[PDB]
Amino acid sequence: MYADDFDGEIEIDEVDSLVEFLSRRPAFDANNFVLTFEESGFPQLNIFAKNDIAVVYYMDIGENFVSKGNGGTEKFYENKLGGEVDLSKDCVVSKEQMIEAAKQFFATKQRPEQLTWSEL
C-alpha cells in the first residue's frame, strides 16, 4: 500500500509497519499522511496529525468525507517547512481513533466503519 507523509513515500506491507509509520511526527510535532492502494491516489485516506489529535478525510471520485469528533478551528501542518491549515474542531478525532481507521482502510481498501463521518 502506498503511504505518504512529510518525508516522502514508502510502501507498507503489514499492519505493524503501518502503526509505526502513523506514529511518525517529523516536524512541528505533526504529520500529513496519505494512504492509498491506487496509483491515481483514489480512494485515499488523508490524515492530519498533531500532538495526540487528528483529522481524517476519506476521498474517492465523487466522494468526500471527514471525521466527526465532538467549535472553532484547529491548526494543522501540511508539510515539513510549516505550511499551515485551519481545520474544524468538529472534525478533530483522537490519535488512537485515527489508527483504528487506518487499520480498517488497510484491510478493506474502503471507507473505515470506525469513525463517524460527515459527507462534504
Binding site: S40, G41, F42, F48, L81, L120
Partner: protein, 133 residues
C-alpha cells in the same frame, strides 16, 4: 505557455519562491469584460474549515468566484509539488455550478503525495455546495 481567459491570453506571473506556504495569482473577467487579479496565499482562516482546501490558493479562488458570480477564472500557484489531491477532488464542490477554473502549477512541478497533480487542471463546478461547519 499562455492560457486563455475569455478574450485574454495570460501566462504565469512572477511569484515568490516557495517556502512551504503556497502563493498564487488569480485572474478573472469582471462584468464589464475587464481583466482583474487577486493575490492569494495559503494558511488563512476560511469560512469552510471543514474542507482542507478552502484556505488553499485554488480554494480561495473558487470561493471568490462563488461569492461574486464569476464564471471563468485562471490561477497560477508556486507549489513545486503541484496541485494537491484535496483540490483535485473538492474544487468542483467549492465552485458554483458550471463555473470553469484552470489551475496551473509551476513548470516542472513534481507531486509527492498520491492524488496530487503536476499538470494543469480545468475544473468545472458541479451542482453541490460547501456544507457549513
Amino acid at each position: 505557455g499562455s492560457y486563455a481567459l475569455g478574450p485574454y491570453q495570460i501566462s504565469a506571473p512572477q511569484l515568490p519562491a516557495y517556502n512551504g506556504q503556497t502563493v498564487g495569482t488569480f485572474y478573472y473577467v469582471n462584468d464589464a469584460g475587464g481583466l482583474e487579479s487577486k493575490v492569494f496565499s495559503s494558511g488563512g482562516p476560511t469560512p469552510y474549515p471543514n474542507y482542507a482546501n478552502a484556505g488553499h490558493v485554488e480554494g480561495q479562488s473558487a470561493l471568490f468566484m462563488r461569492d461574486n458570480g464569476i464564471s471563468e477564472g485562471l490561477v497560477f500557484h508556486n507549489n513545486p509539488e503541484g496541485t494537491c489531491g484535496f483540490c483535485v477532488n473538492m474544487t468542483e464542490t467549492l465552485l458554483p455550478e458550471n463555473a470553469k477554473m484552470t489551475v496551473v502549477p509551476p513548470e516542472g512541478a513534481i507531486p509527492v503525495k498520491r492524488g496530487a497533480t503536476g499538470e494543469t487542471k480545468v475544473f468545472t463546478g458541479n451542482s453541490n455546495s460547501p456544507k457549513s461547519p
